[PDB]
Design the sequence.
C-alpha cells in the first residue's frame, strides 16, 4: 500500500523475497513442445514420494508449474481453471496462454488483503505452437523462452544463458532440465527428486513417469 | 360498529358501541373501542378491529414517548399528522379507520381519519357500519353552541340510531368525554336448562 | 490517548475540551439576553426555522454542518408532528447528535457553540460539542465569554447585550461588526434587528 | 381442517376443552391430536399454524420465564400472541388461540380469544352455551356444562368430534 | 471504526471502563433510598453562574410510568442513555402490555452499556445512574454503572463523595422509614457532600413538588 | 398512458429540416391542453418533436437537456442513438414511455431525421410522420417522393404547410435552417 | 511522518503520490509525438490497444497500467454504444483523472502509480495526453515518460514534428528514443496498430 | 484511523494470544465458585461477591441445565442471554430440551469467534455448566475463557481456583458420592479457600441440581438450609 | 370534483368547492381544498384527497425548506416542478390532479404527471361542464374585479350539474401583500 | 495533529492547514466582482452554463470538485427547474468540501476556488470556497501564491463602478504585476449573458499586450 520513497511497493518486494524460499523451477520452451520442470521439493522421507505435487493442469493444453508459497498458489490456480472453462463455455475455443496468464495477473495485486507470493509458469501449446508465459507476483506476466523460477534459479538463469538454443528439439530440451536440476539442487537428483511434465505439440499435457527421467 | 364524536363547547364527546362481529356472529358483546392513546387524547376505531387496536397501540407508544420526552402533554394535531402518515403508508392494508379526539391548550380537535389517510376535523363525525344512519341524526340535531351535558344526550341517541337501524352495530353505548376540565370514561354507559351434573 | 475519544485516567475526554478550546479560538464573542418580551442575540446569525434562529460560534466551517442538521431536524419535526419544534426540543436533538461525535472515535467534535433563540416565552439555549445543553437566562459564548458572564450576572435588553459586548470586548463598535437578532413576543419571526 | 376450541369460566375453576381430531380434507387422520398445550392455551384452525404458534409462543414465553422466574400474567400472554400473530398481517397464520387459566396467586381466571366463555375454531358453540352458562359453578358443575356444550355442538358438526379433552384449571386439582 | 477501544490490562482489567468509573467520581452527588412508602432520589445541581435554569435538564427524568433515573457522571451521555431506556420501556409496553418490571428495565439498559465495552470504535458510557422503581408490593432501587454491572440496593449514593454518603446511609438509616423520614437521610447524607429531587411511592412517579422540597 | 398529443411531422429541406406539429395535448376525447408546444429545440439547430403521452415528453425533454447540457461543458445521430437507449431501457422493465419522437437535425450538410418508437424501434427516414399522419400524412409525403426523389427548401415547406391542413390548425412550424433552430 | 495516502505533509503535499512518481521511473521509457496526419507512440520495449483509435503507453508498474486499461476499454465502448460515435480521446483522459482521483482522496487505498501516455486520433486533430500518477493530465504538443525522459525532452525544444508526416516522425521518434522499439500509429487514414 | 487498532486478534511471537492470557487472569480477580458432581445430582456453590449490608451469579439456562458465571458480571449477562437463546432455539425445532454438552459447545463457538476475528475484545468469563442431559445423566462442564470445555467431576473457578481444585483432587474420591458427600466436600473447600474460617449465609449460595421426582429441578438453597449446612460447619470445625 | 383557477393582476384569483365525497355519500361539506403549501404557493387538488395529503405536505416540507436556505419566496414553478417529480415518479401508485398557484402563476399537474403551465385551468370530474362558460368569457382587457365574479359564477354552474361538488364556494386571492380568501 | 479526526490541544486540526498550504503554493487566480460580471482570470471550468469556476491548489483534486459542482447544478435544475443561484451553490459545494475535514479517513481538499456567476436578480456574485468549506462573497478575490500580493492591486482597483470592460484587461494587468505568464481570463457578465465563457481571443491578446 505504501509506495516506498524509492518508488516500488514494499509487500511485493517482500513477496519476491518469499519466492527465494520456494522450489527451483525450469520452464523450458522447446519450439516442438513445452517442458515445465520443478524440483520435488520433498525433504522429509516419510512424506509421500508420489503424493506431493508441484505442477498442475489448467486445461488439456495448458500446464501450470508453481513456486514460492505453495498453499497460496492453489487459489490462483483454481480460479485460472474457472476462467478457462468459462472461456470455453462462452466461445467454444480454448483460452490461449496469453490471456490465461493475463486473467491471473489481474487478480494479483487487488489488495485494497495481502499479495500472493507465488511465481507461476503456465506452459501451453496453443495454435501458435509452444508458448511459455512466466508470471511474476508483481502482477506482471511475460512471454519467455527459458526462465527458471525460484531459489537457485538465478544460477539456473545464467546456466540457461549459454545453453539456450535457436529452435530446439523436444527431447533435447528435456535433457537440459534434467542436467540443470542436478546443479541447482543440493542433492543428487533422482526421479523421485523431480516431477517433470511435458506437452508435445500434438499431445495433451502429461505428467512424466519416473523411469523415463533416469535416462 | 357505530363510533362517533362530537365537538361540543369544552371539548369532544367521543361515543362508541360495544359490539364486534366476525361477519354474521357476534363474537364480543362487550368490545372496547375508545382506546386510550393518551390520557389527554383518545381514539375510537372501526373497520377491522385488529388493525385498529394494533395501530392505536403503535400511536399510543409513539405519542406517550414524545410527551414523555418533552414533559409537555402532546397536541392533537401531532396525533393526527402521524395518524395521517401511518394510515397512508400502507395504502389500504390498514383498512381500519379511526376517530381521534383530543384537547391541547390549542383546544378541541376531532378528526375522522379514513383508512387511506384523510384527516378532517369537523364538529360532528361518525364512522363505522352505522355511520350513515348516525350522521343523519348528527346532522339534523347537532347545533353549534351546544353545551357540555347535552352532548351526552346527543351521542347516546345518535349511536342508538346506529344500534337499532344497523345490524353490524349494537349493544351498550360507551361515551367518553374529553375536556381539560375533566376526563370521563363510562365503560358500559347507556343501555338501550341446566345441564344437570353427575 | 489524547487523540481518540476515550477517557483519560482522570475520567475526562481530551478531545471534547479541545473542542471547547477550539470554540474559544474561533475568535467570536456571542451574547444573548432573555428579556421578558424579547430575546436578543448578538455577535453568523442563522434562521434555522422561520420561528427559530441560532448563532454558531467557533470554527466557521463547522457551523454550517450543524446549521443544516438543525434545519433538517426542524423541518422533519413539522413533517411528523405538524407544529414548530420547541427551542428546547431542537437544542436537545442537535445536542443528541453532537454526542455521536463523542461516542464514536471515528469522527470528531464540531467546535461550534450553539446559542439558540426563539419563543416557545423566550428561550436562550446553549449547546456544547460535549452534547450538553441547558437553558440559560443570559448566555454568552466565545473569547471574552467569562468577562461577559460577570456583566450578565450583575444584571433595555438590546442595550444589555450591546453594552455588554462594548464593555467586555472593550471596543466601541461599528454597526456592521455587531449583528443583532431579536424575537419579540409579537414577533416570533426570527428577525435581525437591523442602534 | 380446523378443530373446535371450547373455553369457559364459571368460578375460580377455568374450564377449557377441545376435540381430538384433525382431517386431511374430509378424511379423519388421527383420533388423538393435541390442541390444548399447557395458564393453558387451546389453538384451533390449521394444524400447521396450531403447531407453529404453539412452538413460537413457548419459545418467546420461556425466554421470559427464565429471565424472571415470575410466572406470566394472562393478560400479558394475550398480548404476547396478539403481537405474535399481527406480525403477519400480510401473511397471516390461520389459527385461533383461546387461552384459559388462572391469574397467578390470586386464583383469578382469565380466558380470551384472538383473531363468560369464548368459543372458537371451525365451529355451533356460541349459540349453544350462552344461555346455559351459569355465572357460578363448582368444577363438578363446570365439567358438566362444558361437556354438554362440547358434545352437543361437536357431535352435530361434521369435521370435529371423536374425542374430548377437558381441563378445569384449579390450584387444588386439574381434572381431565 | 470496527475495533473496540476496550482491551485488557496485563492482569485483566478493563482500563477504559476503570477510567469511566473515574468519570462517575466526577459529577454532582446523587443519593437514593428505599424507605417503605416509596424510594426517593435527589441530586445536587448548582446555580453556578446565576444565569442558569433549573427545570431545563433535570437529572431526574421519568422513564416509564413509575421508573426514574438520576445520574452522576457526564451530563451529555445521560441525554442519549435515557432515550434508549425509554425506547426499551415503550417497546416493552407495546409487546407485553404492562409497564416493564423495574428489574427488567435495569437489566436491558445494563446490556446497552455492556455493548460498548465489547463494541468497536466506541468508548464505554461514563454515566452511572440510580434507577429507582416500585412495582407490585416492593420499591426498587437500582444502581447501573459504566460496565453495565447493576445492583439493587436498600440505600445507595453516587457522584462526588459517595464514599462517605454510603457510610451515612448504613448507620443513619436501616430497615424501614416513612418516605419523608427516609428523605431525612437523603437531605442529610447529601449534606455531607439548586437541588433536584424526585420520589416514587405509589402515586405515579413524581418530582418532589418544589414548594414541599422547601 | 395519460394525456397525449399527436400529429408530429418531420421532413428535410435541402439545408434544413421542417418539422411542424399541432399543439393539442388531448386527454381522451376531450382536448384538455389546447396549448402544448411539443417541439423541443435541442441544439443550435437539432430538435425533437414528440407524439405520445406528454409526461414522457417532459421527462425526456429535461433528461435530453441534461445530456446536452453536460456534454456542452465537458449531433442528431447521437441524440437519436441515445434516445433509442432511453426508450429501450424503459421497455426492458416494462415501464415504457409512450412517446414516439422525430429528431430532425442538420449535421454537416446532412439532414438526419431519426424516428424513435416508444418500444425502442429506430431508423432514420427523410420524410417522417408520427401518429395520425403515420397512415394519412405519410402517402402525401411519399407522393411527392414517388415523383421527385429529393425535396427542396420550398418543396418540403409547402408539403408540410398543406399536409397539416389535411388536432386543430394552431401548429408551430419549427424549421432547422443551415444555421438551425427556427420556430414559426 | 507521511506514510499514509490520506496524510498531508506539514512541509507540503501527500507523499504517496510523490512516491508514485518514482514508481514510473523503473518502467522503460516511452515517447509520444504527433503530426496532423498521425499520432506517434514509440515505446522502448507497453503500447496497448485501448480503442480502435486510442492507445496508451505504460511506464512504471504494469499492474496499475492494466487496471486503468481494463477500465479504458469499457469506457471507450460506453461512448461508442450509447451515442454511436467513436469516443473522443479527451473525455476518456478526463475519466482517467476521475478514476485515479479516488486513492489520493481516501485512506487504505494506494495511488495508480503508472504514468501513461494516451495518444489518440481525434476530430480536433490528434492529441496525446500524459497522465501523471495524480489525476492531473496534460494536453501537450509532444511528451516523454518513463526512465531517462529528460534527455528525450531536451531534444524536443528544437523540434517540425507538426509539419512532417508519419514516416519522418517515426524516423525522428527513434532518434528521440535513443536519448526494442514498439510503434503505435493511428491517423485519419488508419486505425491504431502495433507496428 | 486503523493506526490505533491494537488488533486483539493478533497472534503473538510467544505463540499464545494476548487477550486469552489476560482473560485467564481476569478470573483470578473474580470471586471463588465451585461445582461438585455426584451420582444423583450436581451442586454449585458460589460466593456472593461482598457481604455489603445494604445490597439486598448462578442462572437458569433451562430447568434441566444451569450455569455459573465467574470472570465478570457485565459480560456474563450477555453470555447467559445467548445460552438461553441457543437452548430454547434447540428446544424450538428439535422439540426436546437441549443436551447440555451441546449447549456448551454452542456458547464456546460464540466465544471463539471473538478471538479468531473481528478485532473485538473476548468475553473474559469462565463458566460452569451443571446439568443433566438426557443421554448421560448428571454432568458438569467448565468453559475456559477462550473456547474449551472440560467435563469435570468437581472443579472450582474464581480466586484460589488452583488451591481449591487441587484440594479436591485427593478430597474428591471418585464415584462414591451420595449427594450428602457433595454437600460435605462443597462446604469444606469453600470454607478453606476464604480467609474466613467458616462462611456466612451472605457468602455461600448453593444451587443444587437434583432430579426432582422425574422432573429435574434446579433450586437455590433456601437460606435456612444454607445456615444448617453452615451451622454444621461450625461443629465440623 | 371542481378546481377552477384563473390568473391576473396582483395575483391569481382561484377557487374550489366544498365537498369531499366518497362515492355518493358525502363526507364533509366544509373541506378546504385550496390549502397552503407556502405563504405564496397554495395548492389545489383533485384525484383523491388521500394521495394528495401525502403529496403537497411533502411539497410544503421541501418548499419551506427551499425557502429558508435561499431566503426568497420559492418559485412557483419550482413547487410545481416538485409536484411534477412526486407525481412523475409514482403516477401508478398515485392519483392527483393538482392545480398549483403561487405569487400570479397558474400551474397544473395532470395525474400522469406533466407540469404544464395553464393560464386558467379546471380540474376534477365536475370540471368539464365549465368549459363552455370559461372559454367564452376569459378576455384580455378584463380588470381585477372581473375575475372574482367570473370564478365564483363559473363554479356554481359547474356544481349544478356535478353531483360531486356543491358545498360552499371558496376562493383564494393570492397576491403581493395579501391572500383574501372569501367563502 | 497528523490524522484529521484528532484535534491538536491548542484548538485546530493541523491536517486541514497542511491541505490549505497546497493552495498557498499554486499560482494566483484572480476573479473580480464588478458592476456586472465576474472576470475570472488565472495566470476555468464551466461548472454550469450559468456558473464559472477558477481553481487554485493542486489541480488533480480540483477537477473532482468541478465535476461535483456540475452535478450539483444539474440536480438543482432538475428538481427545481430554475438555474441554480450561486449563493446556494457555494454553500452546497462548500458543504461537500467541509465533510472531509470531519472524518479521519478521507483527506481534506487542497484546492480553493472562486466560483462566480452573473444572474439577473443577484447580479454578479463571486464566492470563493476554502478547503475548510468556508465560503464567502467577495468584491474581489485572489488566491494562490501571491495571495496578499495580488490583493494590494485589486484593492487599488475600485470596481464598484468599474465596468467589466476595463476589468477584462485589469485582471491580466494584476496578473502581470504579481507575476513567463500564461494568461487566462473569463467573462461572465451580462454581455456574455451569464454564459461562462473565455474572453474573446483578440481582447485576450490585447490584455496580455
Sequence:
Amino acid at each position: 500500500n505504501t509506495f516506498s520513497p524509492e518508488g516500488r511497493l514494499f509487500q511485493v518486494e517482500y513477496a519476491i523475497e518469499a519466492i527465494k524460499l520456494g522450489s527451483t523451477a525450469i520452464g523450458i520452451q522447446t519450439s516442438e513442445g513445452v517442458c515445465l520442470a520443478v524440483e520435488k521439493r520433498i525433504t522429509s522421507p516419510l512424506m509421500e514420494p508420489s503424493s506431493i505435487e508441484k505442477i498442475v493442469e489448467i486445461d488439456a493444453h495448458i500446464g501450470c508449474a508453481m513456486s514460492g508459497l505453495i498453499a497460496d498458489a492453489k487459489t490462483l490456480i483454481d480460479k485460472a481453471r474457472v476462467e478457462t472453462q468459462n472461456h470455453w463455455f462462452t466461445y467454444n475455443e480454448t483460452m490461449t496462454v496469453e490471456s490465461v496468464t493475463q486473467a491471473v495477473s489481474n487478480l494479483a495485486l487487488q489488495f485494497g488483503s495481502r499479495p500472493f507470493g507465488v511465481a507461476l509458469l503456465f506452459g501451453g501449446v496453443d495454435e501458435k505452437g509452444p508458448q511459455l508465459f512466466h508470471m511474476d507476483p508483481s502482477g506482471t506476466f511475460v512471454q519467455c523462452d527459458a526462465r527458471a523460477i525460484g531459489s537457485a534459479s538465478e544460477g539456473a538463469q545464467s546456466s540457461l544463458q549459454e545453453v539456450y538454443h535457436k529452435s530446439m528439439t523436444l527431447k533435447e530440451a528435456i535433457k537440459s532440465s534434467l542436467i540443470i536440476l542436478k546443479q541447482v539442487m543440493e542433492e543428487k537428483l533422482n526421479a523421485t527428486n523431480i516431477e517433470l511434465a511435458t506437452v508435445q505439440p500434438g499431445q495433451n499435457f502429461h505428467m512424466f513417469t519416473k523411469e523415463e527421467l533416469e535416462e | 360498529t357505530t363510533i362517533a364524536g362530537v365537538v361540543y363547547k369544552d371539548g369532544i364527546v367521543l361515543g362508541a358501541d360495544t359490539r364486534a362481529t366476525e361477519g354474521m356472529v357476534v363474537a364480543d358483546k362487550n368490545c372496547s373501542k375508545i382506546h386510550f392513546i393518551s390520557p389527554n387524547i383518545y381514539c375510537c376505531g372501526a373497520g377491522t378491529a385488529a388493525d385498529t387496536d394494533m395501530t392505536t397501540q403503535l400511536i399510543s407508544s409513539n405519542l406517550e414517548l414524545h410527551s414523555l420526552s418533552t414533559g409537555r402533554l402532546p397536541r392533537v394535531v401531532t396525533a393526527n399528522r402521524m395518524l395521517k402518515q401511518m394510515l397512508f403508508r400502507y395504502q389500504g392494508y390498514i383498512g381500519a379507520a379511526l376517530v381521534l379526539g383530543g384537547v391541547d391548550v390549542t383546544g378541541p380537535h376531532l378528526y375522522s381519519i379514513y383508512p387511506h389517510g384523510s384527516t378532517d376535523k369537523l364538529p360532528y363525525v361518525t364512522m363505522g357500519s352505522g355511520s350513515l344512519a348516525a350522521m343523519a341524526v348528527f346532522e339534523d340535531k347537532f347545533r353549534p353552541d351546544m353545551e357540555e351535558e347535552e352532548a351526552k344526550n346527543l351521542v347516546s341517541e345518535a349511536i342508538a340510531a346506529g344500534i337499532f337501524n344497523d345490524l353490524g352495530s349494537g349493544s351498550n353505548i360507551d361515551l367518553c368525554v374529553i375536556s381539560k376540565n375533566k376526563l370521563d370514561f363510562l365503560r358500559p354507559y347507556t343501555v338501550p336448562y341446566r345441564c344437570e351434573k353427575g | 490517548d489524547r487523540h481518540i475519544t476515550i477517557f483519560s485516567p482522570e475520567g475526562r475526554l481530551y478531545q471534547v475540551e479541545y473542542a471547547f478550546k477550539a470554540i474559544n479560538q474561533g475568535g467570536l464573542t456571542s451574547v444573548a439576553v432573555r428579556g421578558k418580551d424579547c430575546a436578543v442575540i448578538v455577535t453568523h446569525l442563522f434562521k434555522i426555522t422561520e420561528n427559530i434562529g441560532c448563532v454558531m460560534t467557533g470554527m466557521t466551517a463547522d457551523s454550517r454542518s450543524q446549521v443544516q442538521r438543525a434545519r433538517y431536524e426542524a423541518a422533519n419535526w413539522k413533517y411528523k408532528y405538524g407544529y414548530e419544534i420547541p427551542v428546547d426540543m431542537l437544542c436537545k436533538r442537535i445536542a443528541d447528535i453532537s454526542q455521536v461525535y463523542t461516542q464514536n472515535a471515528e469522527m470528531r467534535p464540531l467546535g461550534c457553540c450553539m446559542i439558540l433563540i426563539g419563543i416557545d416565552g423566550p428561550q436562550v439555549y446553549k449547546c456544547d460539542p460535549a452534547g450538553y445543553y441547558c437553558g440559560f437566562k443570559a448566555t454568552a459564548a466565545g473569547v471574552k465569554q467569562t468577562e461577559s458572564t460577570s456583566f450578565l450576572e450583575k444584571k433595555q435588553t438590546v442595550e444589555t447585550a450591546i453594552t455588554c459586548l462594548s464593555t467586555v470586548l472593550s471596543i466601541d463598535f461599528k454597526p456592521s461588526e455587531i449583528e443583532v437578532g431579536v424575537v419579540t413576543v409579537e414577533n416570533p419571526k426570527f428577525r435581525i434587528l437591523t442602534i | 381442517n380446523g378443530g373446535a376450541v371450547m373455553a369457559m369460566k364459571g368460578k375460580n375453576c377455568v374450564a377449557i376443552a377441545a376435540d381430538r381430531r384433525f382431517g386431511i380434507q374430509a378424511q379423519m387422520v388421527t383420533t388423538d391430536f393435541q390442541k390444548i398445550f399447557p395458564l393453558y392455551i387451546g389453538l384451533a384452525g390449521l394444524a400447521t399454524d396450531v403447531q407453529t404458534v404453539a412452538q413460537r409462543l413457548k419459545f418467546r414465553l420461556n425466554l421470559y420465564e427464565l429471565k424472571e422466574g415470575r410466572q406470566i400474567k394472562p393478560y400479558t400472554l394475550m398480548s404476547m400472541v396478539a403481537n405474535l400473530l399481527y406480525e403477519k398481517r400480510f401473511g397471516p397464520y390461520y389459527t385461533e388461540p383461546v387461552i384459559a387459566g388462572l391469574d397467578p396467586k390470586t386464583f383469578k381466571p382469565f380466558i380470551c380469544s384472538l383473531d363468560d366463555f369464548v368459543v372458537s375454531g371451525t365451529c355451533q358453540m356460541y349459540g349453544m352455551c350462552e344461555s346455559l352458562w351459569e355465572p357460578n359453578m363448582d368444577p363438578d358443575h363446570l365439567f358438566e356444562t362444558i361437556s354438554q356444550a362440547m358434545l352437543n355442538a361437536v357431535d352435530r358438526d361434521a369435521v370435529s368430534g371423536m374425542g374430548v379433552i377437558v381441563h378445569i384449571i384449579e390450584k387444588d386439582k386439574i381434572t381431565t | 471504526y470496527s475495533f473496540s477501544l476496550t482491551t485488557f490490562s496485563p492482569s485483566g482489567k478493563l482500563v477504559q471502563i476503570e477510567y469511566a468509573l473515574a468519570a462517575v467520581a466526577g459529577g454532582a452527588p446523587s443519593v437514593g433510598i428505599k424507605a417503605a412508602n416509596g424510594v426517593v432520589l435527589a441530586t445536587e445541581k448548582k446555580q453556578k453562574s446565576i444565569l442558569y435554569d433549573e427545570r431545563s435538564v433535570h437529572k431526574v427524568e421519568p422513564i416509564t410510568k413509575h421508573i426514574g433515573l438520576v445520574y452522576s457522571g457526564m451530563g451529555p451521555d445521560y441525554r442519549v442513555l435515557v432515550h434508549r431506556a425509554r425506547k426499551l420501556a415503550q417497546q416493552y409496553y407495546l409487546v407485553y402490555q404492562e409497564p416493564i418490571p423495574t428489574a427488567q428495565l435495569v437489566q436491558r439498559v445494563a446490556s446497552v452499556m455492556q455493548e460498548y465495552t465489547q463494541s468497536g470504535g466506541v468508548r464505554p458510557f461514563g454515566v452511572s445512574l440510580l434507577i429507582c422503581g416500585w412495582n407490585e408490593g416492593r420499591p426498587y432501587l437500582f444502581q447501573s454503572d459504566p460496565s453495565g454491572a447493576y445492583f439493587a440496593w436498600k440505600a445507595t449514593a453516587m457522584g462526588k463523595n459517595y464514599v462517605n454518603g454510603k457510610t451515612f446511609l448504613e448507620k443513619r438509616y436501616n430497615e424501614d422509614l416513612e418516605l419523608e423520614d427516609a428523605i431525612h437521610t437523603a437531605i442529610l447524607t447529601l449534606k455531607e457532600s439548586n437541588i433536584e429531587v424526585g420520589i416514587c411511592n405509589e402515586a405515579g412517579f413524581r418530582r418532589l413538588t418544589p414548594t414541599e422540597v422547601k | 398512458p395519460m394525456v397525449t398529443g399527436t400529429s408530429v411531422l418531420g421532413v428535410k429541406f435541402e439545408g434544413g429540416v421542417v418539422i411542424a406539429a399541432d399543439m393539442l395535448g388531448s386527454y381522451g376525447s376531450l382536448a384538455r391542453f389546447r396549448n402544448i408546444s411539443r417541439i423541443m429545440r435541442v441544439n443550435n439547430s437539432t430538435m425533437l418533436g414528440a407524439s405520445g403521452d406528454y409526461a414522457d415528453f417532459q421527462y425526456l425533454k429535461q433528461v435530453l437537456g441534461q445530456m446536452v447540457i453536460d456534454e456542452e461543458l465537458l449531433s442528431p445521430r447521437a441524440i437519436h442513438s441515445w434516445l433509442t437507449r432511453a426508450m429501450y431501457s424503459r421497455r426492458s422493465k416494462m415501464n415504457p414511455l409512450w412517446n414516439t419522437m422525430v429528431i430532425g437535425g442538420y449535421a454537416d450538410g446532412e439532414s438526419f431525421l431519426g424516428y424513435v418508437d416508444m418500444l425502442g424501434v429506430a431508423y432514420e427516414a427523410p420524410s417522417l410522420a408520427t401518429g395520425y399522419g403515420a397512415y394519412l400524412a405519410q402517402p402525401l409525403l411519399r407522393e411527392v417522393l414517388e415523383k421527385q426523389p429529393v425535396l427542396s427548401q420550398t418543396e418540403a415547406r409547402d408539403l408540410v404547410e398543406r399536409c397539416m391542413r389535411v388536432s386543430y390548425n394552431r401548429f408551430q412550424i419549427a424549421t432547422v435552417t443551415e444555421k438551425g433552430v427556427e420556430i414559426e | 511522518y507521511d506514510n499514509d495516502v490520506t496524510v498531508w505533509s506539514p512541509q507540503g503535499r501527500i507523499h504517496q503520490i510523490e512516491y508514485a512518481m518514482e514508481a514510473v521511473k523503473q518502467g522503460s521509457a516511452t515517447v509520444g509525438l504527433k503530426s496532423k496526419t498521425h499520432a506517434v507512440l514509440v515505446a522502448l520495449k507497453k503500447i496497448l490497444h485501448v480503442d480502435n483509435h486510442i492507445g496508451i503507453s505504460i511506464a512504471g508498474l504494469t499492474a496499475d497500467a492494466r487496471l486503468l486499461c481494463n477500465f479504458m476499454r469499457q469506457e471507450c465502448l460506453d461512448s461508442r454504444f450509447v451515442f454511436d460515435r467513436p469516443l473522443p480521446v479527451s473525455r476518456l483522459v478526463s475519466l482517467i483523472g476521475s478514476k485515479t482521483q479516488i486513492p489520493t482522496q481516501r485512506y487504505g487505498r494506494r495511488p495508480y502509480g503508472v504514468g501513461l501516455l494516451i495518444a489518440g486520433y481525434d476530430d480536433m486533430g490528434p492529441h496525446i495526453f500524459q497522465t501523471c500518477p495524480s489525476a492531473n493530465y496534460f494536453d501537450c504538443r509532444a511528451m516523454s515518460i518513463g526512465a531517462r525522459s529528460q534527455s528525450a525532452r531536451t531534444y524536443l525544444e528544437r523540434h517540425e514534428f507538426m509539419e512532417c508526416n508519419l514516416n519522418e516522425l517515426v524516423k525522428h521518434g527513434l532518434r528521440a528514443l535513443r536519448e526494442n522499439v514498439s510503434i503505435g500509429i493511428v491517423g485519419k487514414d488508419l486505425e491504431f496498430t502495433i507496428y | 484511523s486503523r493506526r490505533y487498532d491494537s488488533r486483539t486478534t493478533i497472534f503473538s511471537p510467544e505463540g499464545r494470544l494476548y487477550q486469552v492470557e489476560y482473560a485467564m487472569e481476569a478470573i483470578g480477580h473474580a470471586g471463588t465458585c465451585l461445582g461438585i458432581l455426584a451420582n444423583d445430582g450436581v451442586l454449585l456453590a458460589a460466593e456472593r461477591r461482598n457481604i455489603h449490608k445494604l445490597l439486598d451469579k448462578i442462572y437458569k439456562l433451562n430447568e434441566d441445565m444451569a450455569c455459573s458465571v465467574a470472570g465478570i458480571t457485565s459480560d456474563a449477562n450477555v453470555l447467559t442471554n445467548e445460552l438461553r437463546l441457543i437452548a430454547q432455539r434447540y428446544l424450538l425445532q428439535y422439540q426436546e430440551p437441549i443436551p447440555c454438552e451441546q449447549l456448551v459447545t454452542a456458547l464456546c463457538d460464540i466465544k471463539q469467534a471473538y478471538t479468531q476475528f473481528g478485532g473485538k475484545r473476548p468475553f473474559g468469563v469462565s463458566l460452569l455448566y451443571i446439568g443433566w442431559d438426557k443421554h448421560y445423566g448428571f454432568q458438569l462442564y467448565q468453559s475456559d475463557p477462550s473456547g474449551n470445555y472440560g467435563g469435570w467431576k468437581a472443579t472450582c473457578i474464581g480466586n484460589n481456583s488452583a488451591a481449591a481444585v487441587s484440594m479436591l483432587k485427593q478430597d474428591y474420591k471418585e464415584g462414591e458420592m451420595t449427594l450428602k458427600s457433595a454437600l460435605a466436600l462443597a462446604i469444606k473447600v469453600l470454607n478453606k479457600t476464604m480467609d474466613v474460617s467458616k462462611l456466612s449465609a451472605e457468602k455461600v449460595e448453593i444451587a443444587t441440581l437434583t432430579r426432582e421426582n422425574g422432573k429435574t429441578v434446579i433450586r437455590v438453597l433456601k437460606q435456612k438450609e444454607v445456615e444448617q449446612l453452615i451451622k454444621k460447619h461450625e461443629e465440623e470445625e | 370534483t371542481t378546481i377552477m383557477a384563473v390568473q391576473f393582476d396582483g395575483g391569481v384569483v382561484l377557487g374550489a368547492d366544498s365537498r369531499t365525497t366518497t362515492g355518493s355519500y358525502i363526507a364533509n361539506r366544509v373541506t378546504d381544498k385550496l390549502t397552503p403549501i407556502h405563504d405564496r404557493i397554495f395548492c389545489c387538488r383533485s384525484g383523491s384527497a388521500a394521495d394528495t395529503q401525502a403529496v403537497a405536505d411533502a411539497v410544503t416540507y421541501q418548499l419551506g425548506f427551499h425557502s429558508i436556505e435561499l431566503n426568497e419566496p420559492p418559485l412557483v414553478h419550482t413547487a410545481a416542478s416538485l409536484f411534477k417529480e412526486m407525481c412523475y415518479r409514482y403516477r401508478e401508485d398515485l392519483m392527483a390532479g393538482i392545480i398549483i398557484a403561487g405569487w400570479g402563476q397558474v400551474y397544473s399537474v395532470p395525474m400522469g404527471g406533466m407540469m404544464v403551465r395553464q393560464s386558467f385551468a379546471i380540474g376534477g370530474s365536475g370540471s368539464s361542464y365549465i368549459y363552455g362558460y370559461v372559454d367564452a368569457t376569459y378576455r384580455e382587457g378584463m380588470t381585477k374585479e372581473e375575475c372574482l365574479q367570473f370564478t365564483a359564477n363559473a363554479l356554481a354552474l359547474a356544481m349544478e350539474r356535478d353531483g360531486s361538488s356543491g358545498g360552499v364556494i371558496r376562493l383564494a386571492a393570492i397576491a403581493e401583500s395579501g391572500v383574501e380568501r372569501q367563502v | 495533529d497528523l490524522s484529521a479526526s484528532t484535534f491538536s490541544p491548542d484548538g485546530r486540526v493541523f491536517q486541514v492547514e497542511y491541505a490549505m498550504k497546497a493552495v498557498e503554493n499554486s499560482s494566483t487566480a484572480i476573479g473580480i466582482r464588478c458592476k456586472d460580471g465576474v472576470v475570472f482570470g488565472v495566470e476555468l471550468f464551466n461548472v454550469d452554463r450559468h456558473v464559472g469556476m477558477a481553481v487554485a491548489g493542486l489541480l488533480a483534486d480540483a477537477r473532482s470538485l468541478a465535476d461535483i459542482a456540475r452535478e450539483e447544478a444539474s440536480n438543482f435544475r432538475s428538481n427545481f427547474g430554475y438555474n441554480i443561484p450561486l449563493k446556494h451553490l457555494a454553500d452546497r459545494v462548500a458543504m461537500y468540501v467541509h465533510a472531509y475535514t470531519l472524518y479521519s479517513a478521507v483527506r481534506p481538499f487542497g484546492c480553493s476556488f472562486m466560483l462566480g456567476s452573473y444572474s439577473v436578480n443577484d447580479g454578479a456574485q463571486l464566492y470563493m470556497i476554502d478547503p475548510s468549506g468556508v465560503s464567502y462573497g467577495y468584491w474581489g478575490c485572489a488566491i494562490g501564491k501571491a495571495r496578499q500580493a495580488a490583493k494590494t492591486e485589486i484593492e487599488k482597483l475600485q470596481m464598484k463602478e468599474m465596468t467589466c470592460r476595463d476589468i477584462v484587461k485589469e485582471v491580466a494587468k494584476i496578473i502581470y504585476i504579481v507575476h513567463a505568464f500564461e494568461l487566462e481570463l473569463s467573462w461572465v457578465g451580462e454581455l456574455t449573458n451569464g454564459r461562462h465563457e473565455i474572453v474573446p481571443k483578440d481582447i485576450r491578446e490585447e490584455a496580455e499586450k
